[PDB]
């Protein structure tokens, strides 16, 4: 699982997710990566999200869309929505992983409940930030 989210100069949001699945996977099993609203979602009016983790839990919890709906309908900020999904709801179903998100206001979040998540972000015309481990 790899992914990208972006907000362009025109205010467009976009998300993309790509994966090889998981080591020793049986044939024809599908996780969250190719599923709209589970592993990948974008709407100019809310957020762009790409996910990575226990596929079945990201599907059951519709993780990517749940970020948008918690913000849109629940009035949560991006930070609050990410905390709710990644640190509460995913573990509640036995689910490990993380996600990257940008909202329409340019807030960026890279929540994960795992030992690490390969990640990076940067604003245009700024130095990028990278990370592997927690805090």
């Amino acid at each position: 699982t790899v992914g990208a989210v972006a907000l362009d100069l025109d205010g467009n949001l976009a998300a993309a997710t790509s994966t090889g699945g998981w080591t020793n996977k049986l044939p024809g099993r599908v996780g969250d990566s190719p599923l709209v609203g589970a592993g990948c979602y974008a709407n100019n009016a809310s957020v762009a999200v790409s996910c990575t983790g226990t596929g079945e839990v990201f599907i059951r919890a519709l993780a990517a869309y749940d970020i948008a709906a918690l913000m849109d309908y629940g009035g949560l900020s991006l930070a609050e929505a990410c905390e709710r999904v990644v640190m509460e709801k995913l573990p509640a179903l036995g689910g490990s992983g993380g996600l990257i998100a940008i909202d329409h206001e340019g807030n960026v979040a890279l929540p994960f409940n795992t030992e690490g998540m390969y990640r990076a972000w940067g604003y245009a015309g700024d130095t990028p930030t990278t990370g592997i481990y927690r805090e």
Partner: protein
């Protein structure tokens, strides 16, 4: 304007990984996010930026997508991808493909050149080939690192 990328979440420990090992990932993430930043700075679209970032993460054998995909139980590769455009709410996705070098470009093709969101398996592949995407052997994805991780995971 802003980009964020990931190359997967899970049980990364420090006691197992050297600094030179870690720096290869840091340098890889750096170059890709920087490519994305420069595209955004140049006024390229969010769609084109996430497509190119994920294409680069696919090409990079360090990341479990495209080249450097994990091995299935049957020691081949099955790849999946999605792309969504927040401007139109259009999306494209392929699942269970083995003969497309860059699943995210296949997904973008489903988005733009089909009325569908999602295609699977040989239907997805034949759809892409009928629009001039190259057929590849899944052997191109295979790496020693991921084979070694398959043998380890079997124990």
């Amino acid at each position: 304007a802003v980009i964020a990328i990931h190359g997967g979440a899970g049980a990364i420990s420090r006691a197992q990984m050297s600094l030179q090992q870690e720096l290869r990932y840091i340098e890889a993430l750096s170059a890709i996010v920087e490519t994305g930043q420069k595209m955004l700075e140049a006024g390229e679209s969010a769609l084109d930026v996430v497509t190119e970032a994920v294409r680069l993460l696919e090409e990079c054998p360090l990341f479990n997508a495209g080249i450097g995909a994990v091995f299935t139980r049957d020691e081949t590769h099955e790849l999946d991808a999605c792309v969504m455009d927040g401007n139109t709410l259009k999306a494209g996705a392929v699942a269970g493909v083995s003969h497309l070098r860059n699943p995210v470009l296949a997904a973008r093709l489903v988005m733009e050149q089909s009325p569908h969101v999602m295609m699977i398996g040989e239907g997805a592949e034949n759809f892409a080939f009928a629009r001039g995407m190259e057929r590849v052997s899944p052997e191109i994805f295979s790496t020693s690192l991921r084979y070694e991780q398959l043998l380890a995971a079997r124990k």
